[PDB]
Design a protein around this ligand. Structure first.
Ligand code: CL
Ligand code: CL
Ligand code: CL
Ligand code: CL
Ligand code: CL
Ligand code: CL
Lengths: 88, 88, 88, 88, 88, 88
C-alpha cells in the first residue's frame, strides 16, 4: 500500500550530460529506491527515503558537463513502494 | 504549501461518548495540529505530526464509555498545513 | 545493499495461538516489510521500518489466546532490504 | 554541548511501588540515557532519545502496585548529554 | 505550547547583500516556518523543521554578493510554534 | 548496549592535510559522538548521530589543502555508544 515519498525537481543543464545515469548511480550507492526521469521541465527524482544525503551529493558530484540551477522538493504518496531505483 | 501528514481511522464505540472532545484534548496536550471528525465509518484524525504518542495515549486513556476496536493509519498530503487542532 | 533495521523479541504465550499470522496481518495493515518467526525463545519480528505503531498495536490487539509478557528491541543490519513481510 | 531532549511527567500511584527502579530497568533494556526522579508531582523522566517505545512499555508493563493516571511530554534542552540512565 | 526547534547562525558577508530575502525565499520554497534576523553577529535563522535541505541550498545558492564563512546550529525550544516564515 | 550508527568513508586528498583534526572540530561544533581514523583507504568517520549536517559542512568547509573526491555511507551497529568524538 501507500507511503510518504519525496519528489525532487532538478533544473539546469541536465539533459545530454549523463544526468539520469548519474542519478541512478548515486541512488545505487545510497541504497535508495524510486525513479528518475526527464519530463521536459528538468529531471524528476522520486524517492522512498529521505533525500538529504542524495541532495548533498547531487550538488557536490554533479557531472562536469551538467549544471544544476535549482532543486525543488515536495512530498507525495507512493501508490506502491518501489523495490529498485530505475530510469524511466 | 504541501506537507506529509497522517490520517488515523479509529473504529469502535466512538460516537456519543465524548470521543471527538477526547481526541481534541489529547491533541492539545501533545501540541498536535490537524483535525478530527466523525464521517460515519468511525473517527478520522488527521495530524501534521507523527502519531505515535497520540496513539499510545488514545488507547490507554480511552474514555470509559468508548471502546476502540481498531486503528488504521495511512499517509496523505496536506494542501496547507494546519495551525490548530480542530473538531470538524 | 545494507540498511538499519529493528529486531523485536516477543515472549509469552505466543505459539499455538495464531501469533505469527497476527503479526503478519498487522504488518500488512501497516505496510511493513521484514519477517516473523518462532525460533524457540518467543517470536522474532524483523522490520525495515520503525516499530512503534506496530508495537502499540501488537499489545492492544493481541489475540485472545495469546499473552505478551515482554518485548525487547535491538537494531541490526539488513543484508538486503525486504520487499514483503513474510512468515518464516 | 546542548541537544533536544524530552521530559515525561508520569502521575498516578507512582511512589512506594518500585516505580523509579522500574523506569530505570526499562531505560536499561531500551538503551536510553537520562534520568528519573520523583519531585512530588509524580515521576519525571528525562530522556535523550525518542520516548515512544519507552512509553508503550511503561504502560503495558506497569508494576502491579503502581497505577499510571496520566503522562505528559514536553521538549527541553540538555545542557550536557547524559551518558547513563540514573535515578536522581 | 512548546516544541523543539533549531537556530542556525550564519556568518560571513551576509548583510547588504539580499541575504535575509534569500533566506525568506528559500524557506518559502521549502515550506519552512520560523524567522530570520540580522542581530549583528551574522544572520540567525530559527526553524520549526529540520534544517538539512535548507542548509544544503543555503550554501549552493548563496547570492553572488554574499559569502558564507560558517554556519552553526543549536537546538532551542519554541514558546509557540511559528505559522509563517518572517523577516525580523 | 547496541545502537544504529553510520560509517562514512571519505576519499581524496585527505591525509597530511589536517583532515582528521578538521573532522574532529566539525564533530565538536555539531555535538557529534564517534570517531575518525585514517585506515589507508581514506578517512573513516563513525557517528552515533545522523550525518547530514556533518556532510554538508565537510564538503563546504573542506580545508584548503584537502580535496574530497567521494563519500560513501553505510549503517553499522555500535557495540557501545560513544560518549566523545575522538581521533583514532
Ligand atoms: Cl535528463
Ligand atoms: Cl464521534
Ligand atoms: Cl509462534
Ligand atoms: Cl517515585
Ligand atoms: Cl542581513
Ligand atoms: Cl588522514
Amino acid at each position: 500500500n501507500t507511503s510518504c515519498g519525496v519528489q525532487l525537481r532538478i533544473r539546469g543543464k541536465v539533459q545530454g550530460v549523463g544526468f539520469r545515469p548519474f542519478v541512478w548511480q548515486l541512488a545505487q550507492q545510497l541504497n535508495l529506491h524510486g525513479d528518475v526521469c526527464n519530463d521536459g521541465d528538468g529531471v524528476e527524482v522520486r524517492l522512498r527515503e529521505d533525500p538529504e544525503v542524495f541532495l548533498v551529493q547531487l550538488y557536490q558530484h554533479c557531472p562536469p558537463l551538467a549544471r544544476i540551477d535549482s532543486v525543488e522538493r515536495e512530498p507525495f504518496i507512493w501508490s506502491q513502494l518501489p523495490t529498485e531505483f530505475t530510469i524511466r
